[PDB]
Design a protein around this ligand. Structure first.
Ligand SMILES: CCCCCCCCO[C@@H]1O[C@H](CO)[C@@H](O)[C@H](O)[C@H]1O
Ligand SMILES: CCCCCCCCO[C@@H]1O[C@H](CO)[C@@H](O)[C@H](O)[C@H]1O
Ligand SMILES: CCCCCCCCO[C@@H]1O[C@H](CO)[C@@H](O)[C@H](O)[C@H]1O
Length: 552
């Protein structure tokens, strides 16, 4: 049972909630929430979750949005369990090998304790409460230990109770303490649970869950035997090919791990032997976070037009990177079984799915048994006016438009199609009195968000880039979005992409989008019509309720 404490639903949220709830209660497996930018999709998801009272998983297209959603849900359900199943492949380097330059890359060690802490807090809550909402990036869905063992291996709250501490994955280190380590300096225990930020001093209640998701198994001895059996078979494979270097590499690394496991029941990169620990057969789908949820959990795929394709391509992407480590003797073929799920395998592990997007993709449109939209924004803000302007004298027209807006405190976003164009336009604008910066495609997150942050803070007035479908670009001061080569083919000029880009001007009471082109492509035509449809519906709602837009 959840306890919603956020703002009451306004605009189209009430209608969206209900209908969405009605569809789910009627047993629809696939449902889509078609919600324009700024209509408050998080609150809608939250009320649906509250109404159904089932634990939920919300997947986002990237780590920035994932973190953002987690933070919002925590504020909306201050008394329930909101988890962020962050993944190590989000901020750190995984093991890898690039044939191109024969360079092998080790995964980062001694990572920030917050990573594993958040992950353990997630599995712990899922096995102790129903009022749980888990947010995660799609990439987070990867092989994980067997949930049965993780579950059946707990410690309820003497002296034998320090034989348990270890068969749960906890390690000794009286020196410095770490989450998932114990300190026994005499008659006094100090367990630091893998999911806590505050250790537990024991002298003279709670429930301790394992410190690892791949904790030791049944015939540990017998398991190391099966792994070594695969090792020599694979060594022979290389030997017969004359690839002595690969045979040597695989032998040394595998024997090192086997020895490590025989002396600590664990070893760095233990996940690679996942299948041996879960007893899964080769090729079979591994256990994942999904298996830790109750059978009736609800799934939300935020930005579904992006997240669905991500879920569809995860397996292939991972296979390519892993297959390389296998081909050159760094890992056993069995490491391939510690992988992401194929899309169909994912669908086999979920019951009901709610797709969320302002521009739902083909999968959601062909499969949803119900599409519920929310167009009216709680704020009453209108979708922008969209104009089509000639390419003749585009830059001069744009420049005067930008300077006019900067004069009165308004910002401009500009999208071009090539790097040369982005480079030249930016320098040209700067040389003509405009505070413009270039959002280079090589910029990573936070750095990309740092630049965007400066625009939000008003350090400059115009941001030029190729792909503007980035996070954090919904700024109230942006009143103009200019799209050069608006009629050219390509992903960034598709119907959906145009609609998404147009939305960057919907947080300003005077928002406008200028499409520079000498012809109207079908994508433009459709995007213009949809923006007009939304604007008209919201103007009608505002008229009826006596609301007049204002920027804020
Ligand atoms: C468990 C380890 C088994 C090692 C057995 C290696 C057998 C070598 O294998 C041989 O290598 C030659 C290389 O010139 C090839 O030409 C032969 O075809 C191949 O059978
Ligand atoms: C055409 C002449 C227009 C004059 C209006 C100028 C409005 C200035 O604009 C304001 O300046 C403040 C201080 O820099 C900022 O903090 C505000 O965010 C910004 O809107
Ligand atoms: C460029 C995209 C054009 C899309 C066509 C939108 C048509 C909306 O319909 C409009 O409704 C108005 C009611 O206020 C009427 O006054 C207009 O005559 C009518 O065209």
């Amino acid at each position: 049972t959840f306890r919603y404490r956020g703002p009451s639903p306004k605009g189209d949220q009430p209608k969206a909630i209900a209908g969405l709830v009605e569809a789910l209660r009627d047993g629809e497996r696939f449902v889509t929430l078609l919600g324009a930018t700024g209509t408050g999709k998080t609150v809608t998801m939250a009320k649906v979750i509250e109404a159904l009272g089932r634990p939920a998983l919300v997947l986002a297209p990237n780590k920035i949005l994932a973190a953002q959603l987690a933070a919002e849900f925590r504020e909306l359900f201050p008394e329930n369990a909101v988890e962020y199943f962050i993944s190590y492949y989000d901020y750190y380097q995984p093991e890898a090998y690039v044939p191109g330059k024969d360079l092998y890359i080790e995964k980062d060690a001694s990572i920030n304790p917050e990573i594993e802490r958040l992950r353990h807090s997630t599995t712990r809550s899922l096995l102790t409460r129903r009022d749980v909402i888990v947010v995660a990036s799609v990439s987070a869905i990867y092989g994980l230990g067997d949930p049965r063992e993780y579950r059946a291996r707990n410690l309820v709250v003497r002296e034998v109770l320090l034989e348990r501490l270890l068969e749960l994955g906890y390690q000794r280190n009286d020196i410095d303490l770490s989450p998932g380590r114990f300190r026994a300096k005499g008659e006094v225990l100090e367990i630091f649970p893998a999911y806590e930020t505050e250790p537990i001093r024991v002298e003279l209640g709670f429930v301790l869950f394992p410190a690892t998701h791949y904790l030791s198994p049944e015939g540990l001895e017998e398991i190391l035997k099966e792994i070594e059996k695969e090792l020599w078979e694979r060594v022979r494979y290389f030997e017969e090919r004359g690839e002595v270097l690969y045979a040597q590499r695989l032998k040394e690394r595998t024997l090192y791990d086997l020895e490590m496991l025989r002396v600590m029941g664990t070893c760095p990169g233990v996940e690679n032997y996942a299948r041996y620990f879960t007893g899964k057969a080769p090729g079979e789908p591994p256990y994942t976070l999904l298996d830790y949820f109750p059978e009736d959990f609800l799934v939300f795929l935020d930005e579904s037009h992006v997240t669905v394709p991500q879920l569809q391509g995860m397996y292939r992407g991972d296979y390519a990177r892993k297959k390389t480590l296998v081909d050159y003797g760094f890992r056993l073929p069995s490491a391939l079984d510690n992988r992401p799920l194929r899309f169909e395998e994912f669908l086999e592990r979920v019951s009901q799915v709610v797709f969320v997007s302002a521009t739902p993709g083909p999968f959601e449109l062909a499969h949803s048994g119900r599409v519920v939209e929310q167009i009216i924004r709680p704020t009453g803000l209108l979708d922008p006016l969209v104009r089509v302007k000639p390419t003749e004298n585009q830059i001069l027209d744009l420049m005067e438009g930008i300077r006019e807006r900067a004069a009165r405190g308004e910002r401009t976003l500009v999208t071009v199609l090539t790097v040369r164009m982005a480079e030249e336009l930016t320098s040209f604008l700067v040389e003509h009195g405009i505070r413009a910066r270039y959002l280079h495609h090589e910029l990573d997150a936070f750095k990309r968000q740092a630049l965007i942050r400066d625009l939000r803070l008003g350090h400059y007035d115009c941001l030029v880039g190729i792909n503007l479908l980035r996070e954090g670009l919904d700024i109230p001061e942006v009143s103009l979005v200019a799209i050069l080569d608006a009629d050219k083919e390509g992903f960034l000029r598709s119907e959906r992409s145009l609609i998404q880009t147009i939305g960057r001007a919907a947080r300003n009471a005077r928002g406008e989008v200028w499409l520079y082109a000498d012809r109207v492509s079908e994508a433009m035509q459709r995007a213009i019509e949809e923006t007009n449809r939304r604007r008209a519906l919201q103007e009608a709602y505002n008229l009826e309720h006596g609301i007049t837009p204002e920027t804020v």
